Design a protein around this ligand. Structure first.
Ligand code: PLX
Ligand code: PEE
Ligand code: PEE
Ligand code: PEE
Ligand code: PEE
Ligand code: SF4
Lengths: 49, 98, 303, 99, 129, 59, 83, 70, 156
């Protein structure tokens, strides 16, 4: 998918790895609060494609 | 002694002078040393081939090998000096003095 | 009429390089339960022409701060070396009949790393330079074993002349005399041309691409000449040409097959592969192939 | 003479093709808008150089096999190859081939 | 006479040495040394030293100057002196060089020992600590 | 119920050791993978000739 | 005895490349001293004429030096023909 | 099917035919209908030079048979 | 006259070359990327049309935005677009890339990738089928076939 990864290495070996997420934060959990249960069902289709 | 030998000797002299100038960048000193090696190789090969000295055809390769070995050594030393200062500049080597 | 011979060697090599891209696409697609390009031209036959015209009419991107000198120098050296590696090859008659043809090919292949080094240096970035250094290390590592395997094999030939490889294999192929050396030679040529499973890395890009491909085809032809000796009739060289071309095509298709069959190594894994599996065995087999002609009183003629 | 002409032709074609590739899209108007120094890479470069020198010594072997002194030649060739193997073994056991 | 082609090559040799001896931007010095080495190998090949010139071309250029470039990137009257007769049914330089394993046993021993000691020495120097 | 995926212990007799050594030195599984890929090339591709052919759909 | 066999067994497993390489190198070292054909190779190298055979001046005291190539005196290469 | 790959391969094959074949023909055209003479080791070159001198037309491949012995 | 005839024919040739080899870079942001790999799958085989699979940004001809563009992601997409050599095209795939789609009224979603980059073809769906995206690609090919640069240059 889409992923940002900030990591520091000592040569070849990975010393620290920090993933940065939120490049696909759409705000599904807040949008769900404005729909009925039937209307909010299709969001879960999109949660995991 | 024709002028080709004069040109090879002059190239060796230029490389030796450039090694002795030492503007900076010890790597350039190594480059001058190895250019000196190359001039020596060319001249010795020319002399040996011209006089049909068959058993001396070994000599250039040997020289090549040995000089290359020294070059390797030099590189290593350069690298180590860099690890102490970050740059291979000549003027970093003044801890010991007369 | 030597210029005509140079042109008739140069131009068809580039044409075959252009159409190898199409074969690479078709063969991979058919191994993947699909097809290759079959729309652009009667059989995708015009796909390379479309690719070339598209590539040459696109905007080129200069770094605007790097050394333009080495930037333009690198593709020249790459393509010139790729085309130069073709003159000593006997198919069945070489364009240039060198005494030490094999050594000349080794020297050109050794020079081939300056292009990688200069492109990485003129990239003006740390990450591209790291990639360039990794590629250079792999290339030099594997050309070591290429040289050792090559001289160990040539110990049965009697010289460095490529034309004598035809005479040595008059009755039997060299694959039967030494198959382990052939396997290591094949893998080392895969790693030398940065082909999968060893692929860890508009205009000049196309130039570099042609050189990589020309090198692939030439390496496979050299492999066929070394280990699969075609039978040559001095009154009909076309039979040798057909046999040699067919074997070269088979080996190139095998390269594509391997690319389609396997994952890729890690850098440390291929470094370990060479240094700890190929080199010890290559040294042992070099000793074996030094001893064998003396042991069996089968030393080749020429000295 | 033939080889110099061949090299000149190859270099000339490469130069012509590169320059036309670099200059064909330059005529039409457009927008027209560190420290690390891993030691292992240097080590592998130096190892390649040393093995290259030993290969250079090994290269005259095809001609070395017609000498009438087959025993001495075989002894010396095997000596050089064993020397190469010893260099490889020493570099191996001293953690010189790691990452 | 092609206007003293040996003299032309030697002059290009000297000019390349002048270029790289000024020591500008060690990468450019390495490029000058590469050009000079190519010219010198050409001189040797034209003189009749096919194997030795190709040995320059392979060893010197392909390995040693390549290691030099690697390390730098990690950081910041002719024609008359010739002979008259022929060589026979062999090349004299190849026979002389091949005589290394039969005649030059002492040379082989000392060179191999020096190379092994060089491997040992390089590791010790770079071990650090 | 549960299953073990990687709980085999290789045999240690001379024959099994030599089979593993032959696999290591003669590249048997790599040739097997090549053979699998070779088979795929000879069988019919799954590509349809769009736009002259259309993927199946339903009401 | 047992230790050597067990070590060879444990090297043939998990390290077969080194075992094969060492075996091939050791064979290359030992076998040439035991083969009966190496002397034939030395003789074949001795029998290849690279230079002109300079004739000797007859002084009436050379029974073993032929006066013509077709004379029976001198070295023969029947062993080479039969090989 | 898979023989759709054959045309392109065939095309490349023809390309790889052109160099080798061409060489032979040039070597027949510039050497009087014979293979180009191989001159290694400087004795073969001496034979070539002698042939060129005695040809009478400054071309080594013009061979002189017993018709020229008089 | 011949002066315009040669430019018409040369423009035809250049357009055919450009369209017949389209190398796309892909922003597989979300679930439309799945239908794009399905258009790359054996059944549809985009590669047989001259459209290679997963080219690099520096040798790409068209960008396919397949998924939602969030406010955290927009600068990276604009930068990748700016790296692309010209001539370059953008294909917007799915509702999320077209106009925001199911997340249009969200505090963290860009309401259409055309607020960031100019778009040439809009492929509608949630997700568009592999066939729909193939239709969009062939429509882009026709759009390229329609263009005429040498004629405009000659007439100015
Ligand atoms: C005698 C003192 C020994 C104790 C002191 C030790 C000092 C250091 C050891 C090194 C000295 C080794 C002496 C060998 C000299 C070589 C020359 C001599 O042996 O004759 C040769 C005999 O050859 C022998 O086979 C030499 C083989 C010995 C080398 C193998 C092992 C060497 C290891 C020595 C140390 C190197 C590194 C350490 C490794 C453990 C010549 O052979 P031949 O064909 O008649 O003549 C050729 C001339 N022709 C062509 C005109 C006919
Ligand atoms: C195996 C075969 C492979 C062949 C390999 C490729 C061979 C090269 C053949 C190239 C064919 C010709 C390609 C030319 C296309 C150039 C790109 C183009 O379309 O030109 C458009 C460009 C845009 O102009 P503006 O309107 O001012 O743009 C301003 C807006 N920013 O217009 C031009 O500059 C046209 C230049 C004049 C060309 C007319 C002369 C014809 C040239 C013949 C071929 C020359 C190259 C050889
Ligand atoms: C690039 C490669 C340059 C040299 C290519 C050819 C070298 C070679 O091996 O053959 C030399 C060739 C054939 O030799 P033999 O095999 O012995 O057969 C003839 C005996 N009957 O004969 C010659 O020596 C003629 C060529 C000598 C003059 C030209 C030498 C090349 C000079 C190159 C200068 C370029 C330098 C530029 C920088 C280079 C760094 C990338
Ligand atoms: C009595 C006297 C006889 C003389 C002795 C002869 C006996 C010889 C018997 C042994 C010879 C075998 C040597 C052949 C090469 C072996 C090298 C090797 O074993 O390396 C492999 C690794 O080799 C590879 O994996 C390379 C594969 C690269 C991917 C590409 C696959 C391509 C395979 C397709 C077939 C290739 C066909 C080659 C022939 C071409 C001919 C031109 C081992 O690595 P690992 O298993 O990971 O572990 C090592 C540490 N224990
Ligand atoms: C005696 C003849 C001499 C000439 C032959 C030599 C030819 C070239 C071979 C030598 C190359 C250099 C070898 C260097 C050896 C280093 C061993 C080593 O350090 O590896 C150890 C392990 O290796 C060992 O155990 C030591 C060697 C094992 C023994 C090898 C075979 C010895 C002899 C067996 C055969 C004997 C004769 C054949 C018998 C059959 C009958 C003919 C650790 O491996 P790693 O990959 O670093 O770690 C793995 C974990 N990540
Ligand atoms: S909601 Fe529609 S546009 Fe968004 S990821 Fe899913 S299929 Fe694609």
């Amino acid at each position: 998918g889409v992923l940002r990864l900030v990591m520091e290495l000592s040569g070849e070996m990975v010393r620290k790895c920090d993933p940065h997420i939120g490049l696909l934060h759409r705000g599904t959990e807040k949008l769900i609060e404005y729909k009925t249960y039937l209307q909010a069902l299709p969001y879960f289709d999109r949660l995991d494609y | 002694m024709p002028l080709v030998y004069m040109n090879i000797i002059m190239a060796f002299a230029i490389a030796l002078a450039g090694l002795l100038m030492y503007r900076s960048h010890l790597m350039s000193s190594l480059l001058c040393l190895e250019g000196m090696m190359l001039s020596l190789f060319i001249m010795s090969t020319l002399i040996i081939l011209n006089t049909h000295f068959t058993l001396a055809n070994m000599m250039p390769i040997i020289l090549l090998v040995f000089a290359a070995c020294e070059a390797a050594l030099g590189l290593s030393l350069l690298v180590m000096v860099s690890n102490t200062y970050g740059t291979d500049y000549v003027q970093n080597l003044n801890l010991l003095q007369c | 009429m030597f210029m005509i011979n140079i042109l008739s060697l140069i131009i068809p090599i580039l044409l075959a390089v252009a159409f190898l891209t199409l074969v690479e696409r078709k063969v991979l697609g058919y191994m993947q339960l699909r097809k290759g390009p079959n729309v652009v031209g009667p059989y995708g036959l015009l796909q390379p022409i479309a690719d070339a015209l598209k590539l040459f009419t696109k905007e080129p991107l200069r770094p605007a701060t790097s050394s333009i000198s080495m930037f333009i120098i690198a593709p020249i050296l790459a393509l010139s070396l790729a085309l130069t590696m073709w003159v000593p090859l006997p198919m069945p008659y070489p364009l240039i009949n060198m005494n030490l043809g094999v050594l000349f090919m080794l020297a050109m292949s050794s020079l081939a790393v300056y292009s990688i080094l200069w492109s990485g240096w003129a990239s003006n970035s740390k990450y591209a330079l790291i990639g360039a250094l990794r590629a250079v290390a792999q290339t030099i590592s594997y050309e070591v074993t290429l040289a050792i395997i090559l001289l160990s094999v040539l110990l049965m030939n009697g010289s460095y002349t490529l034309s004598t490889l035809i005479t040595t294999q008059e009755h039997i192929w060299m694959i039967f005399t030494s198959w382990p050396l052939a396997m290591m030679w094949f893998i080392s040529t895969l790693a030398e041309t940065n082909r999968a499973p060893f692929d860890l890395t508009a205009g000049p890009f196309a130039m570099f691409f042609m050189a990589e491909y020309a090198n692939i085809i030439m390496m496979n032809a050299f492999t066929a000449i070394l280990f699969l000796g075609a039978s040559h009739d001095p009154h009909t060289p076309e039979l040798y040409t057909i046999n040699f071309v067919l074997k070269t095509l088979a080996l190139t298709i095998t390269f594509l097959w391997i690319r389609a069959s396997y994952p890729r190594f890690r850098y440390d894994q291929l470094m370990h592969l060479l240094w700890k599996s190929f080199l010890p065995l290559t040294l042992a087999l070099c000793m074996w192939h030094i001893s064998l002609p003396i042991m069996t009183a089968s030393i080749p003629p020429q000295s | 003479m033939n080889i110099m002409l061949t090299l000149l032709t190859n270099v000339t074609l490469a130069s012509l093709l590169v320059l036309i590739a670099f200059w064909l899209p330059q005529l039409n108007a457009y927008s027209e808008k560190r420290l690390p120094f891993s030691m292992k890479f240097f080590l592998v470069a130096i190892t390649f150089l040393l093995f290259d020198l030993e290969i250079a010594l090994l290269l005259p072997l095809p001609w070395a096999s017609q000498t009438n002194n087959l025993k001495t030649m075989l002894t010396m060739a095997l000596f050089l190859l064993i020397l190469l193997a010893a260099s490889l073994a020493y570099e191996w056991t001293q953690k010189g081939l790691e990452w | 006479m092609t206007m003293y082609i040996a003299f032309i090559l030697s002059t290009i040799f000297v000019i390349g040495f002048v270029g790289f001896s000024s020591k500008p931007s060690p990468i450019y010095g390495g490029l000058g040394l590469i050009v000079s080495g190519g010219v010198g190998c050409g001189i040797v090949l034209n003189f009749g030293g096919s194997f030795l010139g190709l040995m320059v071309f392979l060893i010197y250029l392909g390995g040693m100057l390549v290691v030099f470039g690697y390390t730098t990137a990690m950081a910041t009257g002719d024609w008359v002196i010739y002979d008259t007769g022929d060589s026979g049914f062999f090349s004299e330089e190849a026979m002389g060089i091949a005589a290394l394993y039969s005649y030059g046993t002492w040379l082989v021993i000392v060179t191999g020992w020096s190379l092994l000691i060089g491997v040992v020495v390089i590791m010790e120097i770079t071990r650090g600590n | 119920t549960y299953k073990f995926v990687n709980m085999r212990e290789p045999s240690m007799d001379m024959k099994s050791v030599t089979d593993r050594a032959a696999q290591t030195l003669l590249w048997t599984e790599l040739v097997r993978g090549l053979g699998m890929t070779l088979s795929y090339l000879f069988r019919e591709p799954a590509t349809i000739n769009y736009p002259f052919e259309k993927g199946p759909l339903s009401p | 005895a047992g230790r050597i066999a067990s070590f060879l067994k444990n090297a043939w497993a998990k390290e077969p490349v080194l075992v094969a390489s060492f075996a091939i190198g050791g064979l290359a070292i030992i076998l040439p001293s035991l083969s009966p054909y190496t002397n034939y190779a030395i003789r074949i190298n001795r029998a290849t004429p690279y230079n002109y055979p300079v004739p000797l001046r007859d002084d009436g005291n050379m029974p073993d030096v032929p006066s013509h190539p077709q004379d029976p005196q001198g070295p023969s290469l029947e062993w080479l023909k039969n090989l | 099917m898979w023989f759709e790959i054959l045309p392109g391969i065939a095309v490349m094959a023809a390309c790889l035919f052109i160099p080798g074949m061409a060489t032979a023909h040039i070597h027949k055209f510039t050497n009087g209908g014979k293979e180009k003479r191989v001159a290694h080791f400087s004795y073969q070159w001496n034979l070539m030079e002698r042939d060129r001198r005695i040809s009478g037309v400054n071309r080594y491949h013009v061979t002189k048979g017993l018709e020229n012995i008089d | 006259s011949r002066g315009e005839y040669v430019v018409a024919k040369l423009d035809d040739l250049v357009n055919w070359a450009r369209r017949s080899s389209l190398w796309p870079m892909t922003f597989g942001l979300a679930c439309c990327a799945v239908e794009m790999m399905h258009m790359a799958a054996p059944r549809y085989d985009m590669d047989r049309f001259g459209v290679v699979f997963r080219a690099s940004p520096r040798q790409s001809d068209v960008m396919i935005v397949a998924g939602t563009l969030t406010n955290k992601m927009a600068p990276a997409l604009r930068k990748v677009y700016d790296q692309m050599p010209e001539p370059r095209y953008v294909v917007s795939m799915g509702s999320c890339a077209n106009g925001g789609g199911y997340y249009h009224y969200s505090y963290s979603v860009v309401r259409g990738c055309d607020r960031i980059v100019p778009v040439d073809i809009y492929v509608p769906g949630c997700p568009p089928t592999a066939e729909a995206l193939l239709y969009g690609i062939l429509q882009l090919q026709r759009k390229i076939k329609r263009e005429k640069r040498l004629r405009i240059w000659y007439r100015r």
